Amino acid sequence: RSVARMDGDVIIGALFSVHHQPPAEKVPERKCGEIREQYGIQRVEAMFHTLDKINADPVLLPNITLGSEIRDSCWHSSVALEQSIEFIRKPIAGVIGPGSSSVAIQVQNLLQLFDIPQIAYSATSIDLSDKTLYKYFLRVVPSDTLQARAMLDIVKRYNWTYVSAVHTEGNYGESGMDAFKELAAQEGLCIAHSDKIYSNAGEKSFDRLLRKLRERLPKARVVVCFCEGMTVRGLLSAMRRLGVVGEFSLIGSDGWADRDEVIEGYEVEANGGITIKLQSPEVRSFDDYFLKLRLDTNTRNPWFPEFWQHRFQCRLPGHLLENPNFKKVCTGNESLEENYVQDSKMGFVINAIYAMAHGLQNMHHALCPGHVGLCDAMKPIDGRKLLDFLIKSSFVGVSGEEVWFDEKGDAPGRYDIMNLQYTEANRYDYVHVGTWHEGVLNIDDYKI
Amino acid sequence: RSVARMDGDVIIGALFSVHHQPPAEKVPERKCGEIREQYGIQRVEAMFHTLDKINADPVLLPNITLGSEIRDSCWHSSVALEQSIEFIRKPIAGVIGPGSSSVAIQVQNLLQLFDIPQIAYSATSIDLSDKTLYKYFLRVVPSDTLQARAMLDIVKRYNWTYVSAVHTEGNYGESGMDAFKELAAQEGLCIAHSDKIYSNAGEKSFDRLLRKLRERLPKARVVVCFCEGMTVRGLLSAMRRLGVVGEFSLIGSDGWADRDEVIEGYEVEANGGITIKLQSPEVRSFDDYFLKLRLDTNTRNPWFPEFWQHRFQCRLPGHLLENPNFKKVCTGNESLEENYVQDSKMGFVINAIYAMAHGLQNMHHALCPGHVGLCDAMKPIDGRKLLDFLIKSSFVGVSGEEVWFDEKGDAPGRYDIMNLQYTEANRYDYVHVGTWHEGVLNIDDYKI
Ligand SMILES: N[C@@H](CCC(=O)O)C(=O)O
Ligand SMILES: N[C@@H](CCC(=O)O)C(=O)O
Ligand SMILES: [Gd]
Ligand SMILES: [Gd]
Ligand SMILES: [Gd]
């Protein structure tokens, strides 16, 4: 239910976490949480926006219009699987996403049965590099074999020999932590306390988690978290309910990154943190499209009305999706510019789309030479063949990056190290302090 | 392709590993290995056999005939998922199986979307006890929280303080080993070398695995293997290619059990082993049905012809499934009694069927009172309601055991400890040496 569509000649499906995951007690009936912006609306919009550009470009896919069938994943293998069934009930050419790795594996375990190439933008698990199990998977981001290596170089940087380790329950935090503990054993690094926890677990689960970490103090101060954002938020939420501040040195994975929605409200118990982030320049182009949107003109995005209400804390009279948590009426002229922050991985969301465009491009030059539009060869489009063209593609990203894939569907990349600190002004922000590229760790010591 | 059917009023689907899993290079095209007997043909036969009995019984389901749609799983999440799609393309009332835990989770992640109760007979992972993720799952066997506890009591029994740990890649060996290492940390037991490996990995993978284990010698002799049978077989296969005998003390999980197909051919490098086995008396009834089968009269089991050939190393002239590995022609009067060994879990395969029968029984007494057959209430049969009746069922097993479920779909059980040794005669066999029931470990010391 609730699907964002756009008709054309070649349809490209996509899964985006429009809402949060269903509470533990609602999983069976599959009722998703609340509306999301960074990981939801912004991605659905960046989907249409990119397509308009590609369908307006004379070089990329001359007389071929790309359509799209976007579906909500709610960041959960169950709902994401419910929607994938819809994709296989014009046929789909391929799928963009989903977000999580555990959710990606699920969707992949199905799509591969119907020969449908899948390209991710945030799934970074090493397990997906195995092409014997996930033949139809590829991504515009590098696996975590490099991130785990980066995180260890940070621990060796400040001579921390005794650290705790916490990861989010799921194929992401686990596959990443195992690679870390494997490199930690070779380096002679001792793991103090080890634990795991879901992202939707009750506060009591975090109370027990936080307590088990404090018991290892003061020798075990540094805490490595190959964790999702909501997992780090829950931990900071427990640090509040208990009344503890500055007792740990948190070092999180890309799940944290420079995301402002993770530490929003808990800047205090979050200060002094060091994080990891896939190098992705903020797309200058998207801000011009998104900020100009209006509740009256935007009609192709079904979840917009629900978004606008929760976005400005107002309700839409008589509307079906009328929010019963606010009482003041929406004017319809509010500015999205207030408290606006672009999706940290917005750049990858776009190149994942271009990777699908050029894929159909090289295939057209090979199967339908000289022709203008789709020919007998690309009717219908063969998925098994499209997979080969995708892997054999290379182009210049939306922001100027180099995009190509290897034999494992993995793409090259690098990281930027962030340090959350209180600036000269009354504000907490993520400061650019360092980078990591091919075993090289350059950290600015006077900035921390 | 190739489906075993039986028509009736209420159809019960089931997944059995008729063939082995596809080699690593054949997973994408989903081409299964060779025919299986213990985990394949015997279970398909035990399926029909039990149904004939239930449909011949006057008390259990009076005038209601149970049918069945059996499908091959090849013991692989991909093929098992391909077949589940067929189940949801008369409708199915529920599903029996599959075998592995990782494969069970896959099938469960789909069936729960269409409200179809699933009952296993060999899936023992602790993860399946979570009813928020697998609401429609239940089993006639207890989770491994008890087996891991049992294996540790065996290590403490002989005062082994330094042991190695190996498990099969997958939700089974992992969820089981983590529970072991958790209890090992509390007991102050040190884990020497730790490793993991798939069951279909190349011999080189086992050569490297075996080598990494020998390097920890002689202090690390005892080896705990929460491993599948084929994983233990591969290890013994490497012990052969290297020329090592009696260097370890292997202690395996139920994946090994008293199975003769695991150590067949490698009795030498397998002697002196101690295993775990779910208490399940060998069904006296099945042997009378199976051994009397004939290649000419058995027509409801499609995979029989293929089985008979590989069973007696002969080929069927002109037949479609003609085996091109043998040259001598099948007489058709060969006895299945030669080298016959009943499936170790044959008892659970049957009660899983009875658990489905009584489920439809209590539901009939409640929704269609007084009626003879199915009424307006059970047309069609509601899966969500059938789930409640199943959980609230209790009966006497085919061999006299107590069968009932708790709020987590788990069933009570106990284990028998086995010791593989060379008897007085020129033969290697699994000897009954002990039992484990509710924290109590009774091991006969003079029998080992
Ligand atoms: N890299 C994480 C997702 C990080 C995020 O987008 O928050 C994963 O593959 O599960
Ligand atoms: N208990 C194992 C299966 C053991 C076997 O049947 O060989 C599992 O749940 O994966
Ligand atoms: Gd693990
Ligand atoms: Gd910022
Ligand atoms: Gd025996």
mmCIF file of C-alpha atoms and ligand atoms in Angstrom, chain A residues 39 43 75 99-102 122-125 139 144 147 172-173 228-229 254-256 259 278 345, ligand 1:
data_model
loop_
_atom_site.group_PDB
_atom_site.id
_atom_site.type_symbol
_atom_site.label_atom_id
_atom_site.label_comp_id
_atom_site.label_asym_id
_atom_site.label_seq_id
_atom_site.Cartn_x
_atom_site.Cartn_y
_atom_site.Cartn_z
ATOM 1 C CA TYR A 39 16.243 8.190 4.779
ATOM 2 C CA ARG A 43 15.406 9.660 -1.263
ATOM 3 C CA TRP A 75 13.820 -0.743 7.179
ATOM 4 C CA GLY A 99 19.188 0.314 2.928
ATOM 5 C CA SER A 100 20.247 -2.224 5.564
ATOM 6 C CA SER A 101 22.414 -5.245 4.746
ATOM 7 C CA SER A 102 20.191 -7.817 6.451
ATOM 8 C CA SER A 122 24.206 1.937 1.738
ATOM 9 C CA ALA A 123 24.512 -1.852 2.098
ATOM 10 C CA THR A 124 28.168 -2.395 3.026
ATOM 11 C CA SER A 125 28.326 -5.930 4.452
ATOM 12 C CA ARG A 139 26.782 -1.538 -5.122
ATOM 13 C CA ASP A 144 33.445 -3.011 5.315
ATOM 14 C CA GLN A 147 36.147 0.281 7.381
ATOM 15 C CA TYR A 172 25.667 -5.573 9.291
ATOM 16 C CA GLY A 173 26.961 -5.049 12.818
ATOM 17 C CA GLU A 228 23.214 1.671 13.288
ATOM 18 C CA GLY A 229 22.132 5.199 14.142
ATOM 19 C CA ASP A 254 29.044 4.704 9.117
ATOM 20 C CA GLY A 255 25.736 3.968 10.821
ATOM 21 C CA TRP A 256 26.501 7.072 12.860
ATOM 22 C CA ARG A 259 23.924 12.277 10.785
ATOM 23 C CA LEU A 278 31.939 7.267 3.415
ATOM 24 C CA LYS A 345 24.485 9.350 1.571
HETATM 25 N N1 LIG C 1 26.186 0.396 6.200
HETATM 26 C C1 LIG C 1 24.961 -0.014 6.946
HETATM 27 C C2 LIG C 1 23.882 1.062 6.813
HETATM 28 C C3 LIG C 1 24.292 2.417 7.364
HETATM 29 C C4 LIG C 1 23.190 3.450 7.246
HETATM 30 O O1 LIG C 1 22.760 3.731 6.108
HETATM 31 O O2 LIG C 1 22.754 3.979 8.289
HETATM 32 C C5 LIG C 1 24.427 -1.343 6.428
HETATM 33 O O3 LIG C 1 24.872 -1.768 5.342
HETATM 34 O O4 LIG C 1 23.574 -1.944 7.115
#
